[PDB]
Amino acid sequence: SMSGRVGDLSPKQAETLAKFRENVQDVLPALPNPDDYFLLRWLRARNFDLQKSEALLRKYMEFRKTMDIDHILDWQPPEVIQKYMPGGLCGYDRDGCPVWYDIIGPLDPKGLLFSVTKQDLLKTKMRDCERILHECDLQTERLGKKIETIVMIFDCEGLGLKHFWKPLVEVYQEFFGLLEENYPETLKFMLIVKATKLFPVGYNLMKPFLSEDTRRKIIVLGNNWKEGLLKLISPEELPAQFGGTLTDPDGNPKCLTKINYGGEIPKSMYVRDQVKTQYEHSVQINRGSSHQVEYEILFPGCVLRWQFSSDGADIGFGVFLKTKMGERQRAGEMTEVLPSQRYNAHMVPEDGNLTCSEAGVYVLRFDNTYSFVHAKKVSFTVEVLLPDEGMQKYDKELTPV
Predict the structure, then answer these.
(1) What positions does the domain CRAL-TRIO occupy?
(2) How far apart are the C-alpha atoms of 193 and 230, rounded to whole Å?
(3) Residues 269 and 174 both lie in one domain
C-alpha cells in the first residue's frame, strides 16, 4: 500500500491529488503555502474522498477568516495569558518534529476564565498552532527533509477536580475540536505524563472531540516516563524537568524561557467573578422544606458535578450516600459525603464536584432553612462525568488524587 505522501503516492492517489487541486481551484488564492504536502493532509484525513476532503478544506478557509490566521503570528494575547497560561513550544524530537508542552496541574481555571475569555484562550492556542507549523517549515529547511507533524506532551501531574469546572473543560474541548477540523494529519504523538487516577474522567471529556487518528496516537506513559520521553526526544532537546539536559541559559531545568508553568492569577487581574450559564432545572421550595435529586451509581470513579443559583437568602446544600432507592431518608440515616452547609448562591453561583468512590445512591439535597420568606427558587444542574473504561486499564500506573 502507498502512504499518500509526496514521493509515496499510488497512481490513484496522484490522480486524486491532481484532481482535488484542479477542484480547490477557487480557494487556493488565499493560502501562504499550498504545496502538495498541504493538499495531501486533507486528502489523507478523508481517505482520498474528493467531496469530503473538499468540504473539510472549505470549512478551514472559513476558520482562517474567523480567526484571522493570515495575521495571527502578529496577534498579541492578553498579558494574563502571556504570564499565566501554561505550556509552550520547546525543542524537537529525534526525527526533527517540533514539541509542544502543556502543564495542566498549575493551571488556575477560574483565575484564567475570570480574567480573559474563552475566545482569547482559543485564539492563543491557534496562534501556537500557526507558530508550530512555522517551526515545521523552518525544520524542513534546516534538515533537508519534510517536517509536517508535531509531538504534544501533556504533563498531567496534579490533574484533579479543579480541572473539571465546566467552563475550563469547554475551552479544552473546543481546542481539540479546532485541531481536528483545521490541523488534520499534523499530530505525530500526544504523550501523557504523570497522569493521575482522574485521567480516565478527563480523557472521556475530551474523547468526543478527538478523531480516531488522534486517539491512535495517544500514548499514556507510566512510572518510567522520563525513559519513554528520551526514546523519542534526545536529551539535548528535552528539558531537564522532563528527563533531558536542556536548560535555560542560567541553568534552570524548567526551561522557563520557553515553557510557562501557570500559577495563581492575581485577583486584581479579574474582569468578572462568574461566567454566564443556564441551568437545567429550577424548583420552588417551601420555607424550612427541601428538594433533592438522586443518582444510582454502580461503577465507582465517576465525578458528580453541580452548579446552583438562588436569589435572595442563602441556601443549604449537601450530598449524602444511601444503599438503594427508596423513601426519603434523614441526613443522619445516610452516609455523609459532603455535609450540608449554608451557601450564598445569589451574587455568584455555587459550583462543586466530588468523586464517587463507592457504589450507591448519591442524594444532592437543597435545604431551604435560611429564607424569612414563604418559598424560594433554586436553579441548578447536576451531571455525572464517567470515566473512559479503556483508560481505567492504566489505573495501576496512574498517581493517587
Answers:
(1) 77-250
(2) 13
(3) yes
